[PDB]
Each structure stands twice: as structure tokens, then as C-alpha cells.
């Protein structure tokens, strides 16, 4: 039996990860207390992959939560399906990351990453494989990046051979939220690159588009936006739960999706996403699903693949579907469109089918693409940070927190020396 702990950190991970648990609970039958008031037995035959059983039918979620300001924590609790987490898992830290990648990889952080690794270790020993981990963080910010990096580092430093699929909300391209959004990220990407195995850059501006262009959601709370993020996270780790045909776990994806050891930043995307009125007009079938699976509109990122190439893309389908139809649409959508998909690596697509479909749908899928176009989002951050380290702006803060100038230059260099590669192996 495999095992994945869901490390959460900061207002971002808290609400997003909370939504993760609510979605995965329902798909597994678990109620807002822990009792399996569910139906099919096939839902519990594999729950040791997200829920540790507590003497008394209370399947408790293995979820370590790390916030540096008891506040997004109170939110996690109040939330309906937010009383299932085990007290200890909640690692508070009355202080404030104060949106400073420094005040998170240096000050406030250190005096908490010790307690964090404690919870993690305990939950990491209670396993029979420790397949990997899963961090929910906001690359741009503090409690998300500062802690995220420190924790992600400590995890890889110790547990050496285990996956680490991070679902991060990359800084947006249009409007920003933290003036220090560039700095916070450049220092972060640096770490994420040399440490993780599979990020899933979930840009916010995207989810917003999906909310008004595909779903027509009029008044979109930060709740609806999360459900989308949840669908993906779940789909990716479905085969390591329910059964099916061509199963593919997390190492499978990575090994079959990471060309060279660095191009690991990937692009998410759900599949049957319809509308509040068009649904009655759409007919679900591997065909239709694809024209949407590949409709850049879905790709919840920010780099319309059209303006780049596609190293490797995996699509974990879910539901009773004919593999002929599956392989067909996959190939057909890899011939008609060919100038995009690269050629230095044939059979670019990667199929996968985990039978048991979503609860309330006939078929589904999760498109995870590794585009060379991701350079777009990166380029912005670099250029932004560029005009920010030059006129030495909003740095007095980070500097004081024991972060020498080079510590920033070195970082910029990397994302730039990470931007280059994407073009190097993005030219062939």
C-alpha cells in the first residue's frame, strides 16, 4: 500500500488544501467526522493512501498544516469538513511571515520547521512505502514560499527517494497581490527547481478565465476557484487509489514526463468542465473530452501552448471508456496539431485510465502538460525581479533578515539559466 501526506502552508495551501480534503472525502465516502457513510466497497479497499484509520471508524486525514500566524488555521477548523484533521497536525506559529521569503526561510520559519518535521516524521513512519509528498503553496508570498521551501528542502534532504508533487499558484501575469511578488518567487523557484519532482503551476489569472469564459460562474468566490484546483490534484493521484486498466502512479508520471532533470514544472487542467446551461447541450465522449482537454482555455496556466512547444504531456483519464477511442483521440490530436508537439521525443502523449469515474459524471480526465512555453510565466517574473534588484527596491526588508544581495542574484541567474534550457531543448 502506498502513502501520500498533504503538507499545507499559508492562506493559499490552507483554503486550497481544505478543498482538497473535502473533494477527496466525498469521492471516498468519508463524512465530516470520519465514518464511512459510503456505498461501494471499492472506496475503502484503498484509503490508506490519504486517510489513517483511528480506532473507531474515523478515517483521519494525514494532513500536516503549517501556518506562521494562527488565522488561516481557525478558518481550516470552522470549515464544515475541517474538524477531521488531528489537532497536532495543526502547527501554529503566532508571529507573521509578513510576506517576506526571507522571514520564512530564515527567521520565524526555523523556529517552527523543527515542529513541522516532527509531525511529518511521525506521519511518514506510519506507512508501508511513503510513495511521496504533496505541498500546497503560493510561490508568490511568505508562509507559502518561505515555509514551503524550508519544508520541501528538509523533506528531500531526509527522505531521499520519494516523489513531491507540489501544486503551486505561480505569481499572476496581469495583476499582482504582493508588491514583493517577484522577489518572493525568484528566491522560491530557485529552491523548487533543485529539490521537487513534479510542480503543477496553477496560475490564478487562469482559474479566473475558466470561471467566466467556460463555466460562466457569475459571482465566483475563492471557493469555486479551488474546486477546480482540487479536481486536478485528485485525478493525478487516482490510479494509486481506485482500480482500472493502464494504471500510472506518481513516479510513473514523472519518469514518463520529465525529459531532463529540471523541466518538471507542469501545466494542470480538468476535462468534463461544462457550464450551468450548456451542459444540457454537450454530449460526453472521448472525442468531445479531447477538444476540451487540449483547448488551451482549460490549461489552468498562462502560456497558451500555441506560443511554444510541448515536451511531454500526460492525461490520466477516468471512467468506463474504450482505449481505441482513447489512443485514437490522443494520436489524432497529435497529428492535426504537430508544429506544437516537439519531435526529439516521439509518442509525446501519455495515456492512463483509472476506471472508477468521478462521483456524478460518466467520464473525466486530468491533462498535465510540460510546455516549453512555460518560459512565458518565468520570463515575466525574471524581468519583473530584474527592475527590482537593480534600483534596490523593497529589499531593505529581506536584506535585514540576513539575505545578502548575491542570495537574490544567484536565484535570478537560476530562473534565467532555467529559462534558457526550456529554449535549448525547445528548439530541436
Amino acid at each position: 500500500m502506498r502513502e501520500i501526506v498533504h503538507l499545507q502552508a499559508g492562506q493559499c495551501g490552507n483554503q486550497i488544501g481544505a478543498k482538497f480534503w473535502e473533494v477527496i472525502s466525498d469521492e471516498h465516502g468519508i463524512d465530516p467526522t470520519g465514518t464511512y457513510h459510503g456505498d461501494s466497497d471499492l472506496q475503502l479497499e484503498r484509503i490508506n493512501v490519504y486517510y489513517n484509520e483511528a480506532t473507531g471508524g474515523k478515517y483521519v486525514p494525514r494532513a500536516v498544516l503549517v501556518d506562521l500566524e494562527p488565522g488561516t488555521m481557525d478558518s481550516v477548523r470552522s470549515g464544515p469538513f475541517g474538524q477531521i484533521f488531528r489537532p497536532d497536525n495543526f502547527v501554529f506559529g503566532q508571529s507573521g511571515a509578513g510576506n517576506n521569503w526571507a522571514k520564512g526561510h530564515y527567521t520565524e520559519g526555523a523556529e517552527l520547521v523543527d515542529s513541522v518535521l516532527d509531525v511529518v516524521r511521525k506521519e511518514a513512519e506510519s506507512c508501508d512505502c511513503l510513495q511521496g509528498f504533496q505541498l500546497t503553496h503560493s510561490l508568490g508570498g511568505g508562509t507559502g514560499s518561505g515555509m514551503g521551501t524550508l519544508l520541501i528542502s528538509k523533506i528531500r534532504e531526509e527522505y531521499p527517494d520519494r516523489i513531491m508533487n507540489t501544486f503551486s499558484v505561480v505569481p499572476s501575469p496581469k495583476v499582482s497581490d504582493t508588491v514583493v511578488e517577484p522577489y518572493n518567487a525568484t528566491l522560491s523557484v530557485h529552491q523548487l527547481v533543485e529539490n521537487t519532482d513534479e510542480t503543477y503551476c496553477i496560475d490564478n489569472e487562469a482559474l479566473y478565465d475558466i470561471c467566466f469564459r467556460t463555466l460562466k460562474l457569475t459571482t465566483p468566490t475563492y471557493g469555486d476557484l479551488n474546486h477546480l484546483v482540487s479536481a486536478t490534484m485528485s485525478g493525478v493521484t487516482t490510479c494509486l487509489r481506485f482500480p482500472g486498466q493502464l494504471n500510472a502512479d506518481l513516479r510513473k508520471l514523472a519518469v514518463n514526463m520529465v525529459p531532463f532533470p529540471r523541466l518538471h514544472f507542469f501545466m494542470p487542467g480538468f476535462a468534463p468542465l461544462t457550464s450551468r446551461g450548456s451542459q444540457q447541450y454537450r454530449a460526453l465522449t472521448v472525442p468531445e473530452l479531447t477538444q476540451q482537454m487540449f483547448d488551451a482555455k482549460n490549461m489552468m496556466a498562462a502560456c497558451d501552448p500555441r506560443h511554444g512547444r510541448y515536451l511531454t504531456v500526460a492525461a490520466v483519464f477516468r471512467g468506463r471508456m474504450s482505449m481505441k477511442e482513447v489512443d485514437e483521440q490522443m494520436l489524432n490530436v497529435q497529428n492535426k496539431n504537430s508544429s506544437y508537439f516537439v519531435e526529439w521525443i516521439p509518442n509525446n502523449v501519455k495515456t492512463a485510465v483509472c476506471d472508477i469515474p468521478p462521483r456524478g459524471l460518466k467520464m473525466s480526465a486530468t491533462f498535465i502538460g510540460n510546455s516549453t512555453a512555460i518560459q512565458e510565466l518565468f520570463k515575466r517574473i525574471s524581468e519583473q525581479f530584474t527592475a527590482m534588484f537593480r534600483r534596490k527596491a523593497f529589499l531593505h526588508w529581506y536584506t535585514g533578515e540576513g539575505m545578502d544581495e548575491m542570495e537574490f542574484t544567484e536565484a535570478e541567474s537560476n530562473m534565467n539559466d532555467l529559462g534558457n534550457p526550456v529554449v535549448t531543448r525547445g528548439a530541436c
Binding site: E157, P160, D404, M406, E407
Partner: peptide, 23 residues
């Protein structure tokens, strides 16, 4: 002056390489 950064980042890489040679 203010050597600081030299001993800091070099000490990081030394203790790093020492750790993955212990392992």
C-alpha cells in the same frame, strides 16, 4: 570587507557534500 557570504554559502555547500558522502 564583510566576508560573511563566503563562509556562509561555502559552509552550506561543504556540509551538504559532507552529508551526501555520509549517506
Amino acid at each position: 570587507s564583510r566576508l560573511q557570504r563566503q563562509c556562509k554559502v561555502m559552509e552550506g555547500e561543504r556540509r551538504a557534500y559532507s552529508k551526501e558522502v555520509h549517506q
